[PDB]
Paper text:
The eukaryotic 20S proteasome core particle (CP), a barrel‐shaped multicatalytic protease, represents the catalytic core of the UPS. The CP is composed of two identical outer α‐rings and two identical inner β‐rings with total 28 subunits that are arranged in α1‐7β1‐7β1‐7α1‐7 form. Three catalytic subunits β1, β2 and β5 present in each of the inner rings confer distinct caspase‐like (CL), trypsin‐like (TL) and chymotrypsin‐like (ChTL) proteolytic activities, respectively, with the active site threonine at their N‐termini. Given the vital role in many cellular processes, the inhibition of the CP constitutes a promising target for the treatment of diverse diseases.
Interestingly, compound 4 with cinnamalacetic acid as the aliphatic tail instead of typical medium‐ or long‐chain fatty acids for most GLNPs was not observed in heterologous E. coli, but it is the main derivative produced by P. laumondii pCEP_gli mutant. Thus, the main compounds 3–5, which possess the complete 12‐membered ring structures but contain different aliphatic tails, were investigated for their inhibitory potential against the ChTL activity of yeast CP. As expected, compounds 3–5 showed strong inhibitory activity with IC50 values of 27, 73 and 107 nM, respectively, which are weaker than that of 1 (19 nM) and 2 (4 nM). However, the electron density maps reveal that 3−5 covalently bind to the β2 and β5 active site Thr‐1Oγ and develop hydrogen bonding interactions with the oxyanion hole Gly47 N (residue numbers are allocated on the basis of the alignment to the β‐subunit of Thermoplasma acidophilum). These prearrangements facilitate the Michael‐type 1,4‐reaction of the Thr‐1Oγ to the double bond of the GLNPs, located at C4 in the 12‐membered ring system. In contrast, GLNPs have the highest binding affinity to the ChTL active site at β5. In addition, the P1‐alanine side chain forms strong hydrophobic interactions with β5‐Met45 and the P3‐threonine moiety is hydrogen bonded to Asp114 and Ser118 of the adjacent β6 subunit. While all these interactions are uniform in each of the bound GLNPs, differences between 3−5 are found in their individual aliphatic tails. On the other hand, the crystal structure of the yCP:4 complex reveals that its shorter phenyl side chain is stacked between Pro94, Pro115 as well as Tyr96 of the β6 subunit.
Author numbering:
A (entry chain a): 1 to 232
B (entry chain Z): 1 to 222
C (entry chain Y): 1 to 212
D (entry chain J), E (entry chain X): 1 to 195
F (entry chain N), G (entry chain b): 1 to 196
H (entry chain H): 1 to 226
I (entry chain I): 1 to 204
Amino acid sequence: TQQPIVTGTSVISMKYDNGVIIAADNLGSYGSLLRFNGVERLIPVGDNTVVGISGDISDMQHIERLLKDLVTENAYDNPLADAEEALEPSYIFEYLATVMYQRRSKMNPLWNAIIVAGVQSNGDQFLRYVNLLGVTYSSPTLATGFGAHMANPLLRKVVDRESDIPKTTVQVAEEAIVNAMRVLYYRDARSSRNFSLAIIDKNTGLTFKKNLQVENMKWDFAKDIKGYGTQK
Amino acid sequence: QFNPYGDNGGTILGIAGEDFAVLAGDTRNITDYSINSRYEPKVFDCGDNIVMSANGFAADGDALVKRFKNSVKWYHFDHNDKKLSINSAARNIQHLLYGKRFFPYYVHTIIAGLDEDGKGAVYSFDPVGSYEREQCRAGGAAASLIMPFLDNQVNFKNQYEPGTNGKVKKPLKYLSVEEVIKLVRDSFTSATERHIQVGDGLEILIVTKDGVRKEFYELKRD
Amino acid sequence: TTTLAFRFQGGIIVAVDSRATAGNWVASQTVKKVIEINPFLLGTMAGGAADCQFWETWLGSQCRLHELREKERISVAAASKILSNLVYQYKGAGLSMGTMICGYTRKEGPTIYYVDSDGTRLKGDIFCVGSGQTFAYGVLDSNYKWDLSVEDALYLGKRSILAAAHRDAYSGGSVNLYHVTEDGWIYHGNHDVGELFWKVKEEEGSFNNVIG
Amino acid sequence: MDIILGIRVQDSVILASSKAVTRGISVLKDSDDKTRQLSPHTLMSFAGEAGDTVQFAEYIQANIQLYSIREDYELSPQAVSSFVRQELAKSIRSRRPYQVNVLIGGYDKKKNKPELYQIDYLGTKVELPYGAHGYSGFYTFSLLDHHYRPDMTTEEGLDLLKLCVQELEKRMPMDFKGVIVKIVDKDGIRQVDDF
Amino acid sequence: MDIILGIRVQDSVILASSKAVTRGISVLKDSDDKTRQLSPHTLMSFAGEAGDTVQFAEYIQANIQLYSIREDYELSPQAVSSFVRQELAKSIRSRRPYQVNVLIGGYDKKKNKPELYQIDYLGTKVELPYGAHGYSGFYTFSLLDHHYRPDMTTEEGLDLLKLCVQELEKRMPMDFKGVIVKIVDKDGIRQVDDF
Amino acid sequence: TSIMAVTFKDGVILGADSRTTTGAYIANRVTDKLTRVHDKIWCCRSGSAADTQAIADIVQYHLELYTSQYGTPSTETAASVFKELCYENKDNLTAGIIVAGYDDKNKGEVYTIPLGGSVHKLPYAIAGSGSTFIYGYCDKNFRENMSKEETVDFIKHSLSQAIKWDGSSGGVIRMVVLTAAGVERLIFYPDEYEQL
Amino acid sequence: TSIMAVTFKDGVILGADSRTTTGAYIANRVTDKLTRVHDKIWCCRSGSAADTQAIADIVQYHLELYTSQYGTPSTETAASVFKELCYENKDNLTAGIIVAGYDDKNKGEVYTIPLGGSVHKLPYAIAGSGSTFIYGYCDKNFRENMSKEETVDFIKHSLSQAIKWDGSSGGVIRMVVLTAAGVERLIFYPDEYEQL
Amino acid sequence: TTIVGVKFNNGVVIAADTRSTQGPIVADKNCAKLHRISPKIWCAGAGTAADTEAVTQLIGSNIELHSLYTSREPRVVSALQMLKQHLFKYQGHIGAYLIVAGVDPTGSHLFSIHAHGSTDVGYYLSLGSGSLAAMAVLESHWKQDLTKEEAIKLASDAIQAGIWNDLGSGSNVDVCVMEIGKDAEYLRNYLTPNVREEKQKSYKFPRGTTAVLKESIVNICDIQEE
Amino acid sequence: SDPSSINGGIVVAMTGKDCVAIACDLRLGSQSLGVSNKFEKIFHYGHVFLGITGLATDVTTLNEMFRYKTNLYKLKEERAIEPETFTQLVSSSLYERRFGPYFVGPVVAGINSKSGKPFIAGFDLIGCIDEAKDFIVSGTASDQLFGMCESLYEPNLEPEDLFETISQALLNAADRDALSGWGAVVYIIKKDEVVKRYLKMRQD
Ligand SMILES: *[C@@H]1CC(=O)NCC[C@H](O)C[C@H](NC(=O)[C@@H](NC(=O)CCCCc2ccccc2)[C@@H](C)O)C(=O)N[C@H]1C
Ligand SMILES: *[C@@H]1CC(=O)NCC[C@H](O)C[C@H](NC(=O)[C@@H](NC(=O)CCCCc2ccccc2)[C@@H](C)O)C(=O)N[C@H]1C
Ligand SMILES: [Mg+2]
Ligand SMILES: [Mg+2]
Ligand SMILES: [Mg+2]
Ligand SMILES: [Mg+2]
């Protein structure tokens, strides 16, 4: 049993026709102090998987090292390490899900919520969630923390059920994700303007975008607002 | 303080027919007032014509189902591919559950299948492994909404024959698979209306001598 | 939960209700509160249902191993003590059990041991355990004799559960009867309390407080 | 206080009430009468927290006696029980509630019927053929459920009451030092001096 | 368990022990013997937490019986009490202590003297002319202080014990369902079947 | 919350962020924390929004009634009325208020009233959760008798840092300028102050 | 406590106050919070003095044994050893450590290890109770590739403010300079830094 | 509960879902959460449902009397001030979270008010368990100079977000439009996207199925003549 | 400890074609101990019916209070109170005890004498009105009653059919609750006749 100290906020994600998109801001908060402004919380594993992590950053960095070691280990005595016997998103997830549930069962959890986004060998989209309790679930859109409350409602308007996935292009999906990140910046006190976004496509592979910013912000209407009731 | 348990909502329902059994469950997974998934399968085919669902805390539910599936695999290895009978599966699950007596699997477990005479069977477990063969059992969030309805419409409780006025009970005539599925669907439609954690979809697994079949039905998404 | 067992001329009567609850919610009305340890030994269920089921099933395995090794039926004293020694090892951990180990052997005759999860092991003639125990005791104590017939003893046990099922909110559903003889126990049916109440009211003239 | 029983038969109400007063470690008294006569044909037994019991009973007694003088008329048992219930129902939301449970046994001279009312400290009133407070009912109700008839004589009521007291003496852990029994009928209130 | 008394007279030790076993609400048994024979001339009565009492008593019994067989010799009451005290003194700093108080009454065949030892669950041993555990001493010691003499006969000891039991039955709130009395002397252990 | 008031040559300027949070949720991102109790006596509110609004409304009432009887009140008088409410109800209030005003006789004045209900007259004052991060900056950069443009820059830079580090602060930087010339409202948006 | 480490053109400089408090009593007014784990790898300690000393002693042992087998360790290696102890014993430790070191290949490097046991490589780092008051000041005034004299002034001014506002900080400002030239110790007394 | 307020060109619109709950159970599937303070001042309530009704009716009563006393149509700022001073008095124990909107001679207004007595001004607001879902929609689609038709669309879309994604909210969308120089139009069940499907079976019982002990006529009439 | 589930009991109300039905169990208990099998929870003031579940002392107190208030209403108004007006009176009366409430779950049922329209309503303990078209439930087996009513109910049932539906809803809900049962009563209410039926049910 611990308490999280340095923390990362929402990770948001969704499926589209040919793959998956995942995004997360670059902040490490220390309570209400916005302490660390350059933290990468999307961690790619090979060229087919991205693991997005929220919650405790020290536990994130531990998970980051486990994944790094998983790649090394998979390559040992494996002539097909870069081909048929490469790490799949489903392998990486199940491993993490095993670790998360084991750790909660010893009453010493990794204080995180994790989304594994990727594309399988056969071109299938993979998107699944796991948290400090070892609870797992999949959905056409997934989000952690504040994203669950604010991003999912917006992302579900694009992909409401399974049958909406083939109808959703990568341009529409990315647009929805970027708008969701702006909404979170307006409304989450522990978020930042700077974020990272990753696309895993079955055709074009892994595109990792760093140093993105929330833009096209509406603030002008603030000038007209005066007092809290009767003031002029 | 760290709380190792959670509540993922959901509701499940097992009904044993004369030569079949059904195990149904809604596909909604939740925490607090949020929806995690509108389609997260909760009832599983475990092999040997057995279906299982462990409803409550989804992490413990997944762990238990996983361990039972594994127990079926090792039963085949150790005993010359012998078919695991539903009564034997039930006893095995008791030992899985009671093995964690002082840190329970926070789940209400139901399995369904056919007994060794080919008749429909449902077994129901508490979180610590007390179990019992039953004709009818709802589990989870909306179990209190569904069970009274099943007492009335499956076992004909408080129903008597017209003209006799309480003297002769309504006779316990057997229900077909089509008739059971109607009661399952109406149970979940009703539960969806009055319980916030029930909705999205209903997945039914039907077990007969011919094997395991699936049926899916939409539920209200509010 | 209401369970009773009493020694008499013809052996032992065991009678239990069938209700199980989780707070106010009635979880089941079909619970089997008599555990058939083997063909000669019976155990009753009170407190946590899982603990009684699991450990009295386990007890049956220990009794079977005893008679394989010793080529002789286990004594009720020895069987009850296997269970009481076991639960005593777990004392403090939070097991919840109130049970009566009932049997009929050559050397002992009909014997009942109350075994309990804080370690208690008591031999006796009449025991009643559960939320409805006091109601069942009232009927038992005023009507019990050693020279009851098997028929009258069976009824007394049935009537004592009915008394508790009526008044105690957490007892009811149905009554399960057993008669333990030296050659083994004999099951004497499941009796729905709903139907039994009205039957008893009319035939006995009791429950004049209730309108029927 | 501990055990208070009540049984309404054909033509009378019988109240039985324990004699023991225990202050923690010792039994200070073994002859305590846990009852007050409210009017010539209405008796109230009581049990609950020390001090409050008697204070409440005497306060009720004074008020009913005041009514009797003012109107030159005895209130019906029903009317008295309703008055008592209201006082307890008022009490439960007070700064310091009366922690007192009562049985009111009365003979209504207008209707020529015995009446037994059971009222707990919350102001929960019920008219019954037989009643109790505390753990007394747990032991005795199964016997009363079996043996009770509405057409019982006073002597049959007393015999059924003996069986109840015997079961209490067998299975209750506390020694309540026996019971004082009182009968309420058309002729008024009298105490059974041998029980 | 509840009341356990002990009195050492001229030529014997008398142990009296209540017969009631109460599990919360009901009295489950009214004939319980709260004693074990450790050797032919040594008796141990006990009272404390449910389960622990009997488990401890039988464990001690087994060990003393083992010693008797190994050496073909009966340990003195003093030796047995010292063994018992050490077991309790070991127990008090365990993970889960035995919550058991005992009286050990024995007749030493070497010295031709009766001996009574009182040992509580902490391993506090005292040799006494008369002793008790729990609340029993509060009621009885004033009587024993007054009437006791070291040269009493066994019959006088039993009469003094009756007076102690009567005072307990008068002033104790709990009904302990009387006592089983046992005498330990040069001829061994015997039970007084009428008391 | 990040709030400050700064005296300068021509009078006084009040400054504030616009973020109101319920835990980590931003309940209002365009809050006006600069509130008017008289024509040229304003205040900055921090702590319980309910409490500081209730107080500010009562003060405005007292100064309106003061004005009807005795003419324009001093800034010191306004601060004293605030103090009286904060001090006498300290057990039931969570309010940290900065009072700033312009007289012609006294010119620009700033009074801070922290949690206890004490009053402190200062050349400038900072308060709210975000103020902790700018004690160093404000102490090094404040000068007396600054110009209007310098004071606006001092406040803008200060609150910019407070917003940058404090999660409870954010949104727009509002300001209110109090001089002989009158009452001027200013607003500065994220795209302006973040790049500073 | 007020501690900081700042990379600059020629390497890195660590800075600290000297106050150790037990509540409001100053148990030691001349504490040395800059501690050596290797020739040119030092650290700044904050949190439990017992814990940070115990950790620093173990690290020094590990790097001594590393040096005997594999030659001079990197600053990253030192930070990793610190992290391993802080992370794996997070339940029993209250330690906030800044690790600073000079390689010839990597030049000046700074790693901060806050309470959780996470590692963050930064151009400069501030920590301890007094750091809260200088986030604003340090962010506005830090530049990369400063000279030695500029970096000493940056640290001196920063910790001066931290000391001014934080009661838990005070005494002398100690500094340790890490360059190719070697290891230089500096000290600055109250009469010097208070008038800044 | 999901309640929203949206300002537009010539007025303000208010909206709410229709689900009231007791824990995880749904008490009322078609609850009315839009309260009339006065003819052209309406408000939406979240939190304790009794409190939102009680506090609106009390203020609405006092607003009516004030309007008669002053011979003037009531103002939103009056309702606002009276609500906040009342709620503040009870220190949050009256658990009413309201969005107060309306038109009066001064113009159109939109305010929120929390149980402790704090108030906020805005062009778009949301409240209740579904407020985050609603606010996500409002932040994505709100702009200055909305028309009436756009504001009703935006408001009801924000409620829908709450209906579908928040378990506390559900059933139907209620709307009330308050435009300047017009009667306020209360659109009860503006949307109905949650009609229950036909059941598989009729459960109408055969007459005489239930066992009966006694029957009697109940005398509801008064004491009769003659 | 929880005041609303010490005594136990349930009430359910339903609408039909030109009729309403209100029903209740007869149990009063002290937690596990059954005390009375004749504790009726439905009362009437003229043609308006009020069922009350919860703490039994408050059930009794509120009945006496509404009898008081409806009697004075009638003397002043010179007419019987209507279900819609009475509903507001219950709500008002409960909310005036907002911070020390009556631990009850009232249910109003009746037909408006002028319009002939069937009416039902429910309340929480502090007076929040739930005015459903179909049905209202209250008590310790309210979950069970919701489940029964939600599946069994259909609109526009004739009086004698509505009797069966509400009776089966109550009976089967009560049998799945430890603290409800011990008898039951069903009122069938039409514009100018009211029939009251006691039901035979299991007595455990
Ligand atoms: C007799 C009645 C009786 O004695 N009741 C006393 C309380 C008993 O415990 C009730 C028992 N009921 C059950 O055993 C019941 N199962 C459970 O209560 C499982 C509870 C799991 C709780 C839990 C704690 C922490 C984490 C996860 C779960 C039946 C349904 O299994 C009972 O009915 N006893 C009867 C025989
Ligand atoms: C909007 C949803 C919402 O905001 N939900 C959050 C929780 C709300 O409290 C639910 C609320 N439900 C009710 O109001 C429910 N009744 C109560 O909550 C009664 C509470 C009584 C508390 C109390 C008072 C005095 C003494 C002791 C306790 C109604 C529906 O029966 C709700 O639905 N909110 C909706 C409007
Ligand atoms: Mg739902
Ligand atoms: Mg019962
Ligand atoms: Mg910010
Ligand atoms: Mg029942």
